């Protein structure tokens, strides 16, 4: 459902950071090596964590949103979560930043699970809107809440420069406040 990398959306690959495609039957995951923590890109077929696991897509959903495709990693509680959800929800952590797994939920505040996604809700999807965790519009003062994956397809996500050598602040904005 996304063309290039499904984590950062960039469509260009790079010599030491290539686009890697999952050969998983029924899987259309494509990610940069550096966007999924791939240790060594194989000289043949490669499989995303989900397609390597021992259960069918029916049960393998993200704990943090209602969207089904995209690049998943295992969580603390032996669940699953989008890499992009983990990036753009501030309190989500990674146990190992090199391999980018597992995704650590345990420090996610209760206040991220008691919101309704406005994008979902304007679509009239009241069950989906309450599912998972929401990020908050990065505009000062605005308290609009939305799934990371919903803002991704609405084109509402962005990587802004942060204080530090190469610190990225992964954030988003509601339709009112983008740039």
């Amino acid at each position: 459902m996304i063309g290039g990398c499904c984590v950062c959306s960039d469509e260009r690959g790079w010599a030491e950071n290539p686009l890697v495609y999952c050969d998983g039957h029924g899987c259309s995951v494509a990610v940069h090596q550096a966007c999924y923590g791939i240790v060594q890109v194989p000289t043949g077929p490669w499989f995303c964590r989900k397609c390597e696991s021992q259960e069918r897509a029916a049960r393998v959903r993200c704990e943090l949103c209602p969207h089904k495709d995209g690049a998943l990693k295992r969580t603390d509680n032996g669940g699953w979560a989008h890499v992009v959800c983990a990036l753009y929800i501030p309190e989500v952590q990674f146990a190992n930043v090199s391999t980018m797994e597992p995704i650590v939920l345990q420090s996610v505040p209760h206040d991220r699970y008691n919101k309704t996604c406005y994008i979902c809700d304007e679509q009239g999807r009241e069950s989906k809107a309450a599912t998972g965790a929401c990020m908050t519009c990065n505009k000062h003062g605005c308290r609009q809440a939305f799934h990371v994956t919903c803002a991704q397809f609405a084109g509402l996500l962005c990587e802004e420069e942060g204080n530090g050598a190469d610190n990225v602040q992964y954030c988003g904005y509601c339709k009112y406040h983008f740039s």
Binding site: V7, C8, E16, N17, Q33, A34, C35, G37, V83, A86, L87, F94, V97, S98, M100, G162, N163, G164, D166, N167, V168, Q169, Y170
Partner: peptide, 9 residues
């Protein structure tokens, strides 16, 4: 090459 995760604030 630093991953997206390693760059997160």
């Amino acid at each position: 090459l630093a991953t997206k995760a390693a760059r997160k604030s």
